[PDB]
Amino acid sequence: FMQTNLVAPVGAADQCYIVGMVAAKKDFNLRLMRDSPDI
Amino acid sequence: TAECLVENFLGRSALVCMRSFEYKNKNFFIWTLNTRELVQIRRKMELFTYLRFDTEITIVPTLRLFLPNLTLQAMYVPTGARKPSSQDSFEWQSACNPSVFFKINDPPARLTIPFMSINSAYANFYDGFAGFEKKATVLYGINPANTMGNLCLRVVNSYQPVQYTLTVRVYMKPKHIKAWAPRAPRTMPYTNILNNNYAAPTAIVSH
Amino acid sequence: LLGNISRYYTHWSGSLEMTFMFCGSFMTTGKLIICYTPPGGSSPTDRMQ
Amino acid sequence: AYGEWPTYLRFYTLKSKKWESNSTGWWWKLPDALNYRSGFLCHVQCNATKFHQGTLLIVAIPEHQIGKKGTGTSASFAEVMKGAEGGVFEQPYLLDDGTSLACALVYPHQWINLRTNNSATIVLPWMNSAPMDFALRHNNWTLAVIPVCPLAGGTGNTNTYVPITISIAPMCAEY
């Protein structure tokens, strides 16, 4: 959430963007196979 | 160096109460010890947020007739105890309670009060209301632990035909002072003896 | 990769991590609160929750 | 500074105040802002981009009885209680206490000057003359923040709202 509003200089637009990324950690485990529904 | 030690800065005996009453062809005092009745000592004291001290108090009478060496009683009444109704009252007799009788022509009476509060120091400012919960009538900042009792005084021999005014002057030497949390100086006139309000107003120094 | 690989399997265990990244101009700043809702929680409706 | 580690005997982040070139200043009262014998610490920073100009004095005052102009009348509930929403300084130059802003540096003070630093932090150890206050009805410290020099820089759409973000932790609080 925008806890402050944004602040930017006169030379840079409000077209400012976040990228989000994810992974599992070292501790991860997957139990037992069942074929994927996406294809 | 001299009055640079805070006990010497503060320890000048302040005339904290100055009043009169007559006896002629009611008329007793009950003033609580708070140093807000006189403006110089108000400011000089307000430079510190908390102080712990004994108080010496000295009582000096004076007379304008219209000398009779009367007996004066000073009594100290603690925080929130009963206080008398008139020159005559059972309270002036109180068994469990400090008092001094002195004659007007003796050199003036002195007492020490030890440091007297349920809090560890006098909090010279306090911005709260109560120790448990607040009602509408509980005024902002008048802390009960700062009540410090009252000095109560009467003429004991007041039957006299002769007609006059007793003046009394009360001098407090706060003594053996320990102090904490200094403050920015109070740079503005004082409207009242309770809070700090005002009405120089918008520019503290000249051009 | 998390959601593709794991789709081949019955149930999963262990921790994740997000990484966010901000594509801004160097002179630009702001504070975003991020907050996380553990299992069984309600959605935080606004910044006070 | 007062030289205590925060001590007895998780932060909270207030919504950002929209500063402007004209703004007089803001305050919060502790514990009131948390809604307890404690070492509060307060950590305040500007969301200010490098073109911006102006400066804040950050001060924590003990037992700060807010006064008022033009009456002997004492403050009401709603004037002194403000929670995390906080209150304005009606007269910053008098610090509302009839005392000079210029002398407020006797209280533990820090500067946000936008050249040198956009961030400042203070430790507020317990000052109460009772050992553990427990009622909702007193505030031992007031955090105050005042624009000593007016906010400036930027143009047009930037609209001078350059926010202040305030953060508080009651570090080492016991009950």
Side-chain angles (χ1 to χ4, degrees):
Chain A
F1 308 163
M2 288 205 285
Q3 188 268 8
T4 63
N5 298 333
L6 191 66
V7 177
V10 305
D14 91 325
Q15 302 303 278
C16 196
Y17 277 103
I18 282 163
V19 161
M21 315 185 291
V22 71
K25 201 65 156 176
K26 297 297 194 291
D27 78 324
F28 205 68
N29 282 285
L30 292 166
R31 194 167 306 311
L32 186 143
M33 180 164 295
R34 51 122 300 164
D35 291 343
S36 174
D38 282 17
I39 290 296
Chain B
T1 302
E3 312 94 324
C4 99
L5 184 80
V6 174
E7 167 66 5
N8 292 345
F9 182 77
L10 296 175
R12 189 176 186 175
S13 310
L15 176 48
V16 290
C17 180
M18 158 48 225
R19 298 182 177 239
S20 138
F21 48 58
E22 291 62 64
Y23 299 93
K24 302 194 72 185
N25 182 31
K26 68 184 171 73
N27 303 21
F28 71 109
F29 292 129
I30 55 166
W31 158 86
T32 52
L33 309 186
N34 48 300
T35 64
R36 308 185 188 255
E37 178 145 316
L38 205 311
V39 297
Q40 176 57 244
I41 197 65
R42 181 86 176 266
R43 172 183 160 108
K44 193 181 286 180
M45 192 63 65
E46 282 179 356
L47 305 190
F48 308 82
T49 308
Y50 315 92
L51 312 95
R52 191 178 180 275
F53 53 74
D54 309 58
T55 59
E56 311 310 333
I57 286 183
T58 289
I59 306 93
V60 192
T62 288
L63 304 89
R64 234 293 165 227
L65 314 186
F66 302 118
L67 301 173
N69 181 26
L70 306 157
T71 306
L72 287 164
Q73 182 180 8
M75 168 165 289
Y76 178 61
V77 178
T79 283
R82 292 182 56 106
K83 296 177 294 286
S85 182
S86 287
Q87 192 284 340
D88 55 333
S89 284
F90 307 94
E91 318 315 338
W92 298 117
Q93 315 190 21
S94 294
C96 295
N97 177 231
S99 71
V100 163
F101 293 77
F102 70 101
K103 290 197 289 188
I104 279 179
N105 287 9
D106 270 9
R110 319 80 144 99
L111 302 92
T112 319
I113 321 298
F115 171 66
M116 187 63 68
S117 186
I118 192 161
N119 292 352
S120 175
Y122 290 127
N124 178 254
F125 294 91
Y126 164 92
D127 81 343
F129 307 96
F132 183 93
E133 187 254 26
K134 176 187 186 185
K135 305 304 187 293
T137 61
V138 186
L139 278 61
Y140 161 72
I142 297 64
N143 189 300
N146 290 338
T147 303
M148 66 176 73
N150 28 281
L151 174 144
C152 294
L153 175 140
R154 53 165 191 165
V155 174
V156 192
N157 306 117
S158 66
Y159 76 86
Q160 304 305 321
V162 290
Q163 184 155 262
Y164 64 95
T165 188
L166 175 83
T167 303
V168 74
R169 292 190 169 111
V170 188
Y171 294 82
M172 186 193 294
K173 201 177 72 182
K175 197 202 73 189
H176 205 78
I177 297 159
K178 207 67 56 174
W180 324 81
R183 302 190 70 92
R186 170 47 180 232
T187 50
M188 190 68 204
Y190 296 106
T191 51
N192 72 94
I193 68 178
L194 297 186
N195 72 50
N196 66 351
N197 296 344
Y198 44 89
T202 195
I204 293 162
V205 312
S206 305
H207 321 103
Chain C
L1 263 293
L2 172 67
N4 271 290
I5 297 309
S6 310
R7 223 86 69 63
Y8 280 102
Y9 300 79
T10 297
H11 199 55
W12 56 268
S13 180
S15 62
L16 317 176
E17 69 201 354
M18 268 69 161
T19 299
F20 301 93
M21 179 171 293
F22 178 89
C23 306
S25 44
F26 183 85
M27 299 169 196
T28 290
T29 65
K31 288 186 186 182
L32 296 189
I33 185 165
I34 294 159
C35 86
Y36 158 60
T37 305
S42 303
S43 181
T45 303
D46 72 61
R47 74 194 75 167
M48 299 291 287
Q49 299 92 25
Chain D
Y2 273 19
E4 294 283 30
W5 189 257
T7 40
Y8 40 40
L9 179 57
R10 209 293 190 196
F11 288 86
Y12 304 91
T13 62
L14 295 70
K15 71 189 299 286
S16 61
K17 295 305 190 180
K18 288 184 64 180
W19 182 19
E20 172 56 69
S21 61
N22 66 7
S23 303
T24 67
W26 306 267
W27 58 261
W28 295 270
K29 280 180 175 288
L30 278 60
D32 197 30
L34 176 63
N35 298 87
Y36 53 84
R37 170 55 175 258
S38 49
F40 294 92
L41 64 87
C42 309
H43 168 316
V44 50
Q45 65 279 353
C46 287
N47 303 95
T49 69
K50 206 151 192 161
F51 278 121
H52 288 292
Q53 176 159 296
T55 281
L56 309 174
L57 167 58
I58 285 63
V59 193
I61 304 90
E63 308 297 345
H64 183 213
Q65 286 176 235
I66 298 295
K68 58 169 64 187
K69 289 179 289 183
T71 184
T73 308
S74 301
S76 68
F77 289 73
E79 185 56 37
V80 75
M81 298 144 55
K82 284 298 184 189
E85 162 56 11
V88 59
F89 276 95
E90 296 296 352
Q91 186 40 282
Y93 180 58
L94 297 184
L95 200 72
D96 298 343
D97 196 5
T99 185
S100 56
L101 188 181
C103 287
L105 287 74
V106 173
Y107 315 119
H109 66 283
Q110 302 297 344
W111 291 95
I112 298 287
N113 176 316
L114 302 181
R115 309 181 85 239
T116 52
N117 57 298
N118 73 310
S119 175
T121 301
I122 298 178
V123 179
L124 302 186
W126 188 262
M127 304 311 296
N128 198 338
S129 317
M132 174 168 63
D133 210 344
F134 199 91
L136 303 178
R137 309 288 74 162
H138 171 215
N139 290 278
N140 181 224
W141 286 103
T142 304
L143 200 185
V145 61
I146 287 168
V148 160
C149 282
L151 184 73
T155 292
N157 282 48
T158 63
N159 80 89
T160 41
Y161 79 102
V162 180
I164 301 168
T165 297
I166 302 93
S167 183
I168 307 293
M171 186 52 184
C172 300
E174 269 293 1
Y175 303 83

